[PDB]
Amino acid sequence: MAEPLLVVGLGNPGANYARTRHNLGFVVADLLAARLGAKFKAHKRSGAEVATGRSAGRSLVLAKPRCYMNESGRQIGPLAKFYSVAPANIIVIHDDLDLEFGRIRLKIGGGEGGHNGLRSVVAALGTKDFQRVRIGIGRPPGRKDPAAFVLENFTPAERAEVPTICEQAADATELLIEQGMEPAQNRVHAW
């Protein structure tokens, strides 16, 4: 009974489109990073960003390429098969529309909500029941334009929401390591 955990933050490089929270993975990774203070880097046979983290009585490998999306799917593909890690150890973070623009969505099997990247990860990783941590950024009002509405740019609204949820999820995470998620979920996953 012993095994580390791997984390992968899927977001959007550069910017422009990243403003649409298309950089949740990197936004959350950076946040949790700026908090942890860990000194990440960029390399690996793949050539992406990553950093090790010790806590929760276990190590944590947080990685994240550039393009992320497809870059991640593939990046992990080999990187995943390279490290030979388990699916219950790998956790891919992303953004998704669930309710309002300031919620999170952490699950295991549940994932892949239409995306070349995500699909590239499944095909790259071949699917092993890996874990995923999607964020709840607004919800689909209809069929008018969900993706369009998901790729808005609440830079501001999101700016406050980014730290709002991140803060909430950050607490849930910390508490999770403190004891369990039960409280974090009832505390954080309660709002």
Tab-separated table of C-alpha atoms in Angstrom:
chain	number	residue	atom	x	y	z
A	1	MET	CA	0.000	0.000	0.000
A	2	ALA	CA	2.088	2.855	-1.350
A	3	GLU	CA	1.975	4.970	-4.486
A	4	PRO	CA	2.576	8.598	-5.480
A	5	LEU	CA	0.182	10.866	-7.336
A	6	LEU	CA	0.571	12.773	-10.583
A	7	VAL	CA	-1.174	16.011	-11.478
A	8	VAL	CA	-1.575	17.695	-14.843
A	9	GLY	CA	-2.908	21.201	-15.352
A	10	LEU	CA	-4.573	21.581	-18.728
A	11	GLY	CA	-5.013	25.203	-19.736
A	12	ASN	CA	-4.156	27.585	-22.550
A	13	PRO	CA	-0.752	29.113	-23.322
A	14	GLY	CA	-0.057	32.623	-24.555
A	15	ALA	CA	-3.273	34.482	-23.825
A	16	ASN	CA	-6.124	36.042	-25.763
A	17	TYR	CA	-8.167	32.857	-25.660
A	18	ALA	CA	-6.656	32.095	-22.276
A	19	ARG	CA	-8.637	35.018	-20.913
A	20	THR	CA	-11.703	32.827	-21.261
A	21	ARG	CA	-10.359	30.854	-18.325
A	22	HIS	CA	-8.942	28.625	-21.036
A	23	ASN	CA	-6.041	28.398	-18.615
A	24	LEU	CA	-7.820	26.924	-15.616
A	25	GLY	CA	-5.332	24.085	-15.339
A	26	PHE	CA	-2.460	26.550	-15.435
A	27	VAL	CA	-4.457	29.093	-13.465
A	28	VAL	CA	-5.155	26.636	-10.672
A	29	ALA	CA	-1.686	25.146	-10.944
A	30	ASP	CA	-0.113	28.583	-10.746
A	31	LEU	CA	-2.391	29.551	-7.881
A	32	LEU	CA	-1.672	26.413	-5.891
A	33	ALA	CA	1.897	26.930	-7.040
A	34	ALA	CA	2.216	30.535	-5.929
A	35	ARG	CA	0.747	29.288	-2.671
A	36	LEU	CA	2.970	26.258	-2.217
A	37	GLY	CA	5.904	28.312	-3.443
A	38	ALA	CA	7.303	25.243	-5.160
A	39	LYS	CA	9.885	26.123	-7.785
A	40	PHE	CA	8.505	24.491	-10.909
A	41	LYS	CA	10.481	24.078	-14.111
A	42	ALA	CA	10.242	22.944	-17.713
A	43	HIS	CA	11.920	19.937	-19.285
A	44	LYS	CA	11.305	16.202	-19.303
A	45	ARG	CA	11.658	14.033	-22.384
A	46	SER	CA	8.414	15.725	-23.354
A	47	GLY	CA	9.587	19.279	-22.790
A	48	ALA	CA	6.863	20.794	-20.642
A	49	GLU	CA	6.414	22.401	-17.245
A	50	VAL	CA	6.263	20.348	-14.068
A	51	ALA	CA	7.328	20.227	-10.439
A	52	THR	CA	7.375	17.808	-7.529
A	53	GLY	CA	5.434	18.334	-4.322
A	54	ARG	CA	5.505	16.512	-1.005
A	55	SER	CA	2.471	16.418	1.259
A	56	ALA	CA	-0.696	14.548	2.150
A	57	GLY	CA	1.793	11.853	3.081
A	58	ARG	CA	2.715	11.387	-0.561
A	59	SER	CA	4.527	13.005	-3.464
A	60	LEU	CA	2.835	14.955	-6.231
A	61	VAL	CA	3.967	15.396	-9.816
A	62	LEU	CA	2.317	18.468	-11.290
A	63	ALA	CA	3.065	18.810	-14.983
A	64	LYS	CA	1.630	20.845	-17.834
A	65	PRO	CA	2.846	21.420	-21.399
A	66	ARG	CA	2.224	24.466	-23.558
A	67	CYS	CA	-0.729	24.040	-25.886
A	68	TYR	CA	-1.885	21.965	-22.940
A	69	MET	CA	-5.040	20.731	-24.627
A	70	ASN	CA	-3.541	18.527	-27.314
A	71	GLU	CA	-0.078	19.220	-25.953
A	72	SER	CA	-1.223	17.642	-22.708
A	73	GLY	CA	-3.024	14.674	-24.214
A	74	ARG	CA	0.140	13.707	-26.050
A	75	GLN	CA	2.541	15.063	-23.457
A	76	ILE	CA	0.987	12.724	-20.919
A	77	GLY	CA	0.660	9.936	-23.458
A	78	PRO	CA	4.401	9.225	-23.366
A	79	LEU	CA	5.053	11.010	-20.092
A	80	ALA	CA	2.327	8.853	-18.593
A	81	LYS	CA	3.676	5.666	-20.127
A	82	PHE	CA	7.117	7.041	-19.362
A	83	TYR	CA	6.578	7.278	-15.622
A	84	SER	CA	4.293	4.261	-15.645
A	85	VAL	CA	1.944	5.862	-13.146
A	86	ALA	CA	-1.564	4.776	-12.223
A	87	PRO	CA	-4.806	6.442	-13.330
A	88	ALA	CA	-5.941	6.954	-9.755
A	89	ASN	CA	-2.686	8.844	-9.366
A	90	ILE	CA	-2.983	11.025	-12.445
A	91	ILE	CA	-5.327	13.989	-12.197
A	92	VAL	CA	-6.044	16.292	-15.113
A	93	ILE	CA	-7.484	19.691	-14.277
A	94	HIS	CA	-9.588	21.635	-16.750
A	95	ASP	CA	-12.462	24.078	-17.063
A	96	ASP	CA	-16.080	23.159	-17.691
A	97	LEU	CA	-19.512	24.739	-17.493
A	98	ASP	CA	-21.540	23.299	-14.640
A	99	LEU	CA	-23.377	26.107	-12.887
A	100	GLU	CA	-22.072	29.593	-12.202
A	101	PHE	CA	-18.705	31.081	-13.080
A	102	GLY	CA	-16.923	30.255	-9.844
A	103	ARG	CA	-17.253	26.554	-9.121
A	104	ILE	CA	-15.097	23.450	-9.341
A	105	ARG	CA	-15.716	19.880	-10.436
A	106	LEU	CA	-13.429	17.113	-9.237
A	107	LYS	CA	-14.152	13.563	-10.334
A	108	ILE	CA	-12.440	10.324	-11.284
A	109	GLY	CA	-14.006	8.539	-14.231
A	110	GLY	CA	-16.312	11.378	-15.203
A	111	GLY	CA	-14.585	13.610	-17.726
A	112	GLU	CA	-13.925	14.181	-21.408
A	113	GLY	CA	-16.548	16.797	-22.184
A	114	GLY	CA	-15.698	17.187	-25.853
A	115	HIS	CA	-12.193	18.396	-26.616
A	116	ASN	CA	-9.386	17.336	-28.922
A	117	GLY	CA	-7.006	17.696	-26.000
A	118	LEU	CA	-9.034	15.603	-23.585
A	119	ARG	CA	-9.670	13.129	-26.379
A	120	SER	CA	-5.972	13.243	-27.184
A	121	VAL	CA	-5.215	12.388	-23.575
A	122	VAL	CA	-7.546	9.406	-23.581
A	123	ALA	CA	-6.066	8.208	-26.851
A	124	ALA	CA	-2.595	9.180	-25.699
A	125	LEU	CA	-3.037	7.578	-22.299
A	126	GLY	CA	-5.310	4.981	-23.853
A	127	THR	CA	-7.695	5.569	-20.974
A	128	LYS	CA	-7.011	3.854	-17.670
A	129	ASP	CA	-9.728	5.434	-15.560
A	130	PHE	CA	-7.426	8.343	-14.807
A	131	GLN	CA	-8.676	11.104	-12.540
A	132	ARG	CA	-9.798	14.548	-13.634
A	133	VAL	CA	-10.487	17.861	-11.938
A	134	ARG	CA	-12.696	20.054	-14.091
A	135	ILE	CA	-13.806	23.483	-12.934
A	136	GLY	CA	-17.385	24.701	-13.100
A	137	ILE	CA	-17.321	27.814	-15.251
A	138	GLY	CA	-20.912	28.833	-15.871
A	139	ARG	CA	-23.572	26.543	-17.291
A	140	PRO	CA	-25.177	25.908	-20.687
A	141	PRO	CA	-28.338	28.006	-21.038
A	142	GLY	CA	-29.331	26.029	-24.109
A	143	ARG	CA	-28.093	25.071	-27.555
A	144	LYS	CA	-27.684	28.666	-28.663
A	145	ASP	CA	-23.960	28.644	-27.983
A	146	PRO	CA	-22.541	26.819	-24.954
A	147	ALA	CA	-18.914	26.729	-26.029
A	148	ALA	CA	-19.271	30.297	-27.240
A	149	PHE	CA	-20.580	31.245	-23.818
A	150	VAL	CA	-17.836	29.190	-22.214
A	151	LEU	CA	-15.213	31.060	-24.202
A	152	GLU	CA	-16.337	34.482	-23.041
A	153	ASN	CA	-13.756	36.527	-21.175
A	154	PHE	CA	-14.985	37.352	-17.691
A	155	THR	CA	-11.454	38.580	-17.106
A	156	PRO	CA	-13.008	40.676	-14.328
A	157	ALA	CA	-15.936	38.588	-13.151
A	158	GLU	CA	-13.613	35.634	-13.600
A	159	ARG	CA	-10.793	37.492	-11.889
A	160	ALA	CA	-12.819	37.667	-8.697
A	161	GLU	CA	-14.289	34.237	-9.332
A	162	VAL	CA	-10.905	32.766	-10.173
A	163	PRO	CA	-9.613	33.645	-6.698
A	164	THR	CA	-13.046	33.007	-5.238
A	165	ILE	CA	-13.294	29.370	-6.254
A	166	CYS	CA	-9.551	28.806	-6.280
A	167	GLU	CA	-9.617	30.050	-2.705
A	168	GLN	CA	-12.532	27.781	-1.875
A	169	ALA	CA	-11.047	24.826	-3.718
A	170	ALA	CA	-7.659	25.722	-2.287
A	171	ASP	CA	-9.102	25.423	1.200
A	172	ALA	CA	-10.851	22.182	0.335
A	173	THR	CA	-7.556	20.857	-0.974
A	174	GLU	CA	-5.591	21.938	2.074
A	175	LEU	CA	-8.269	20.583	4.381
A	176	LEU	CA	-8.373	17.435	2.282
A	177	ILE	CA	-4.714	16.881	3.079
A	178	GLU	CA	-5.410	17.991	6.631
A	179	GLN	CA	-7.917	15.202	7.143
A	180	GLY	CA	-10.247	14.400	4.270
A	181	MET	CA	-12.346	15.844	1.471
A	182	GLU	CA	-15.580	14.982	3.239
A	183	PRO	CA	-15.301	18.279	5.127
A	184	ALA	CA	-13.760	20.112	2.196
A	185	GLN	CA	-16.659	18.939	0.064
A	186	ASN	CA	-19.215	19.821	2.713
A	187	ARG	CA	-17.281	23.000	3.395
A	188	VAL	CA	-16.029	23.944	-0.049
A	189	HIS	CA	-18.103	21.683	-2.265
A	190	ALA	CA	-20.949	23.144	-0.244
A	191	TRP	CA	-20.967	26.608	-1.769
